[PDB]
Amino acid sequence: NPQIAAHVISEASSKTTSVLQWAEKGYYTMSNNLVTLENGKQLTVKRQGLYYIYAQVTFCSPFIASLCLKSPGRFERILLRAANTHSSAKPCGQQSIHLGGVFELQPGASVFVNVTDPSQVSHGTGFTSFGLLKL
Amino acid sequence: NPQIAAHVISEASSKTTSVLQWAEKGYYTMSNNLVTLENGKQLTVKRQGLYYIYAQVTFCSPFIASLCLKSPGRFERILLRAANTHSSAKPCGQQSIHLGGVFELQPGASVFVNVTDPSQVSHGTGFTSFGLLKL
Amino acid sequence: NPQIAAHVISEASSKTTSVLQWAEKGYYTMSNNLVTLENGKQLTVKRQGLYYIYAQVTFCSPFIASLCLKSPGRFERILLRAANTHSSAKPCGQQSIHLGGVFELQPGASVFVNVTDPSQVSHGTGFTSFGLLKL
Amino acid sequence: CREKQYLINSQCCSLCQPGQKLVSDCTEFTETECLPCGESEFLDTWNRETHCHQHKYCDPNLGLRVQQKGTSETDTICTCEEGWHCTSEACESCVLHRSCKQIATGVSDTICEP
Amino acid sequence: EPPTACREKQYLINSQCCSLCQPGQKLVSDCTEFTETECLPCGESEFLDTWNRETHCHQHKYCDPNLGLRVQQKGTSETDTICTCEEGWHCTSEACESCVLHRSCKQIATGVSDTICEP
Ligand SMILES: *[C@@H]1O[C@H](CO)[C@@H](O)[C@H](O)[C@H]1NC(C)=O
Ligand SMILES: *[C@@H]1O[C@H](CO)[C@@H](O)[C@H](O)[C@H]1NC(C)=O
Ligand SMILES: *[C@@H]1O[C@H](CO)[C@@H](O)[C@H](O)[C@H]1NC(C)=O
C-alpha cells in the first residue's frame, strides 16, 4: 500500500512509564514499513512529510496528556497538550481527552503521548488510542 | 467526485434506541454514492479502504459515546469509546466528546455512534456531528 | 508544496475579543499561499474544496468554543460548537475542547474559532491550536 | 451587479429565492439553478448558499419548547417551558421557577417575601 | 588516525560538516561544501537558547494569569520568558507551573516559597 497511516491500541503498561505504552493488537492499523512502533512506546515515520497525528487518552480519578515529539538531532518538544479536570465521582469517574493536529515530520522522527498519571489511563477496549496519517 | 467523505448532523429521535440518529440536513456533506446514510442511523462505505472516522457528541447532564463498527460477516464491535463524568450545573450543564481514528473498512461496512443516555445528547446546531473521510 | 494544510498556535489576544487570536509561531504549519492567516484572526483558503478543519481550545475556571465560518457573499454561520463546564479546582482548573469536521469551503472562505470567555483560554505551549487540511 | 443576483467570474447569476439553497452557477447557455431546503432546514434570505440552515433546536434538557415551527424560509422560534424563564436577553437556557411577592413569566423571574 | 569529526559548534550532514545556528536563529537550509548553513532569527514570542539545527523556534513560555502567574522577565530571541506567582500567591511545585495563595495562620512566603507556622 502507498498511504502511510497508523492507529495503535493502548496497553497495560508494564509499570513505571510516564510515557504511554501502545500495542499493535485489537483493531489496529499499520499501513506499512513507513511507520513503525519503536519500542512499543512511540511511532516513528520514515518518509519526511506533513502528517496529521492524534491520540485519545481516557483516565479516571489536573491530568495532562502531552504529545511530546522527538526528531533526530533535536531535543524532544511539545506538539500538543490537553488538560483535564479531575472529576470528583464516586469511585473516580472516567474522562477522555483528544489531541490532533497537522505537523511537519522529518524522517526518523518519533511521536509519543506522555501523561501525568499513567496509573489512571483506562485501557478498556477502545478507550485509549494513538495514531497518525500522512497528508 | 473522486474523494469519499461524509459529515452528518445529529437529529433528535422518536424511537428510544441508544443509537444516535443523523440527518443529511444543515451544513452536511456526502461526497457521493460511495458513502450513504443507511436508515439514518449509520454511515456505510462501499469501497474498501483506510478511512478516518470521527464523531462529536454533546450531552447535557458515566456518559459513554461508543463508535461500535458493523462489517459484513462479522459481529459488530468497538472502534472507539469516549467517557465523561456527569457534572452539575444550572439546568444540566453541557459537555462535548470527540472521537476519531484511522480504521480499515471493507465494502458494505457501516459505522455508528452509540451512547448511554440518548435522551441527553443536545442537538443544537453544530453540537453533535458524525462523519468519515477516505485516506 | 502541492498539499494545502495549516496549523496555527493561539496567542494571548489584546483586544480581549470573542474571536480567538492565532499566530504563525512555534511549531506551526502553513503549507503555502493557498491558506493564509488573515488579520491573525482567521484562516482563509484560496482553492475551493473539501477540507478537514479542527481546533482545540483549553480554558479554565457554560464555556463554548464555536467554529463559526465566513464565506464570501454569505452571512457567517456555525460549522461546529463544543460545550463544557467550570470545575472549581483551586485557582481555575484547566479543560480542553476539540473540534474537527469535513466541510465544503469555496475560495476566499475563512474559518475562525469564537469562544464565550476569551479571557480564560490558556495559551500555554501546545494548549490551544487551530488548523485545517484539504482532502 | 444588482440586488437579487450576484456576480462570479464575469457573468452575473441571480440569487435564489428565500427557501432554496444554491446548486450550480450560471453560464453562457443556462443560469443559476436551485432546489428547496429540506423539511427541517431553511434560508430566510435571497442567498447564494450551498447548504441551508437547520431549524433551531429547542432542546428540552435546557427547559425550552417549540414555540413556532420553521418554514423553508423562517427559522423555528423557541421559548421556555411554563414555570421556567430565560437566563439572559437571548433565551439560551431556562431555569425552574424559584419558589418559597410578584410571580415570574416566560422571561420574568419570581420574587418572594414574608 | 585522521581527524574523524566536526567541530564544537557544528553538525555532520551529507558527509559534510556544517555550522549550527546560533542561539536566537532557526535553521532554514542545510549547507553545501562551499556555501555555509543558512539560518534565520526567531520571530517575536519565539526563541532558541542553543546552537541548534531546529526548523521551528520555541514559543515564549506563557504566564497564564488564570493560574496566578505573571511575566517576571520577558524573553529575548535566545532566552525563554521567566514566570513567577502574583503577590499573595505561591507555587504548588518547585518548578512553579501553577500558583496558589499564601496560607495564613512563621517564615513569610515569597511565592517561590511558602509561609511556615506554629502557635
Ligand atoms: C514525558 O517524558 C519526558 C522525557 O521524554 C519526561 O521527562 C517528562 O516528565 C514526561 N512528561 C512531561 C513532558 O512532563
Ligand atoms: C449500544 O446499543 C445497544 C442496543 O441499542 C445498547 O444495549 C447499548 O447500551 C449501546 N451501547 C452503549 C451503552 O453505549
Ligand atoms: C461568537 O460566535 C457566537 C456564535 O457563533 C455568538 O454568540 C457571538 O456573538 C460571537 N461573538 C462575536 C460578536 O464576535
| CATH code of E118's domain | 2.10.50.10
DSSP sequence for C20-46: PEEES-SS-EE-STTEE-GGGT-EEES
State how far the Cα of E26 lies from the Cα of E14, in Å rounded to an integer. Answer: 19
- Cross-strand bridge partners of residue A29: A7
CB contact under 8 A, C82 and B27: no
Which chain E positions have a beta carbon within 8 Å of C59's beta carbon?
A: 66
Which residue has a Cα nearest atom 6 of ligand 2?
Answer: B18
State how far the Cα of D45 lies from the Cα of D48, in Å rounded to an integer. Answer: 9
Nearest CA in chain D to B93: D62
Question: If phi over 0 gives left and psi between -120 and 50 gives alpha, with beta otherwise, what is residue B127?
Answer: alpha
Among all chains, which residue has been given the C-alpha cell 548553513?
E37
State how far the Cα of C120 lies from the Cα of A25, in Å rounded to an integer. Answer: 40
Main-chain dihedrals φ then ψ at residue B39, nearest 5 degrees: 50, 20
* Nearest alpha carbon to residue C57 among C19, C108, C24: C19
Chain C adjacent subunits, 3+ CB pairs under 8 A: A, B, D, E
Exposure string for D29-58, b = 16+ CB within 10 A, e = fewer: eeebebebbbebbbbbbbbbbebbbbbbbb
Nearest CA in chain A to B104: A29
Query: Do both D76 and D109 map to the same domain?
Result: no
State how far the Cα of B52 lies from the Cα of D107, in Å rounded to an integer. Answer: 45
Nearest CA in chain C to A68: C126
Query: Do both E92 and E78 map to the same domain?
Result: no
Question: If phi over 0 gives left and psi between -120 and 50 gives alpha, with beta otherwise, what is residue C26?
Answer: left
In angstroms, the first-to-last Cα distance of chain B is 15
E4 CB contacts (<8 Å, ≥6 apart)?
Answer: none
Dump strand ranges (E) for chain A.
5-10, 22-23, 29-30, 35-38, 42-45, 49-60, 64-66, 69-70, 81-83, 94-105, 110-111, 114-115, 129-134
Query: Do both D104 and D66 map to the same domain?
Result: no
In angstroms, the first-to-last Cα distance of chain C is 14
Q: Which three-class secondary structure state does DSSP give residue E65?
A: helix
Query: Do both D68 and D92 map to the same domain?
Result: no
Query: Do both E116 and E70 map to the same domain?
Result: no
Among all chains, which residue has been given the C-alpha cell 414574608?
D114
**Are C18 and C114 spatial neighbours (Cβ–Cβ below 8 Å)?**
yes
> How many angstroms separate the CA of residue A122 from the nearest CA in chain B?
10
Position A60, amino acid: C
Which chain A positions have a beta carbon within 8 Å of C5's beta carbon?
A: 50, 102, 135
State how far the Cα of B113 lies from the Cα of B130, in Å rounded to an integer. Answer: 8
Q: How long is chain C?
A: 135
- Structurally, chain D folds into a number of domains equal to 2
Q: Cα angle vertex C97, ends A105, D63, to 5°? A: 160
Please name the member of D48, D51, D93 whose beta carbon is closest to the beta carbon of C73.
D48
State how far the Cα of E43 lies from the Cα of E51, in Å rounded to an integer. Answer: 16
Range of the domain at E95: 86-119
**Are B19 and B55 spatial neighbours (Cβ–Cβ below 8 Å)?**
no
Which residues contact ligand 3 via a Cβ below 6 A? C 18-19, 66, 68, 78, 114
Which helix or strand (DSSP H or E) is residue C65 part of? strand C64-66
**Are B40 and B22 spatial neighbours (Cβ–Cβ below 8 Å)?**
yes
Which chain D positions have a beta carbon within 8 Å of B11's beta carbon?
A: 40
Question: If phi over 0 gives left and psi between -120 and 50 gives alpha, with beta otherwise, what is residue D63?
Answer: left
CB contact under 8 A, C62 and D93: yes
Q: How many CA atoms lie within 13 A of C7 on its CB side?
A: 23
Name the residue of B59, B114, B116, B117 to mutate for ligand 2: max ligand atoms within 8 A of Cβ. B114
Q: Cα angle vertex A34, ends A33, A40, to 5°? A: 75
DSSP symbol at B45: E
Q: How long is chain B?
A: 135
State how far the Cα of B39 lies from the Cα of A24, in Å rounded to an integer. Answer: 34
Query: Do both D111 and D60 map to the same domain?
Result: no
Q: Cell triple for residue E92?
A: 504548588
Which helix or strand (DSSP H or E) is residue B66 part of? strand B64-66
Position A131, amino acid: G
Query: Do both E78 and E102 map to the same domain?
Result: no
Q: Cell triple for residue B44?
A: 456505510
Domain ranges of chain B: 1-135
Please name the member of B25, B120, B122 whose beta carbon is closest to the beta carbon of D38.
B25
Neighbours of A100 (CB within 10 A): 28
**Does any CB of chain C come closer than 8 Å to the CB of residue A89?**
no
Q: Is chain B in touch with chain E: ≥3 Cβ pairs within 8 A?
A: no
Neighbours of B128 (CB within 10 A): 30
Please name the member of B85, B99, B103 whose beta carbon is closest to the beta carbon of A95.
B85
CB contact under 8 A, A77 and E52: no
A49 CB contacts (<8 Å, ≥6 apart)?
Answer: A4, A104, A105, A134, A135
State how far the Cα of C46 lies from the Cα of C5, in Å rounded to an integer. Answer: 12
**Are E49 and E79 spatial neighbours (Cβ–Cβ below 8 Å)?**
yes
Q: Which three-class secondary structure state does DSSP give residue E66?
A: helix
Q: Cell triple for residue B17?
A: 434506541
**Are B58 and B94 spatial neighbours (Cβ–Cβ below 8 Å)?**
yes
* Nearest alpha carbon to residue E114 among E85, E82, E71, E83: E85
Breaks in chain E (C to N over 2.5 Å), named by the residue before each, are 105
Looking at CATH, the fold of the domain delimited by A1-135 is given as Jelly Rolls (2.60.120)
Which atom belonging to ligand 2 lies closest to the Cα atom of B17?
Answer: 5
3-state secondary structure chain D: CCCCCEECCCCEECCECCCECCCECCCCCCCCECCECCCCEECCCCECCCCCEECCCCCHHHCEEEEECCCCCCCCEEEECCCEEECCCCCCCEEECCCCCCCCCCCCCCCCCC
DSSP sequence for B94-109: EEEEEEEEEEEE-TT-
Query: Do both E95 and E37 map to the same domain?
Result: no
Main-chain dihedrals φ then ψ at residue C63, nearest 5 degrees: -50, 120
Query: Do both E90 and E58 map to the same domain?
Result: no
CB contact under 8 A, A3 and B67: no
**For residue D106, how far is its CA from the centre of ligand 2 (angstroms)?**
37
Q: Cell triple for residue E25?
A: 536563529
Dump strand ranges (E) for E30-115.
38-41, 46-47, 58-59, 69-73, 82-85
- Entry resolution (Å): 3.5
DSSP sequence for C75-127: ----S-EEE------SS--EEEEEEEEEEEE-TT-EE--B-S-TTT---STTS
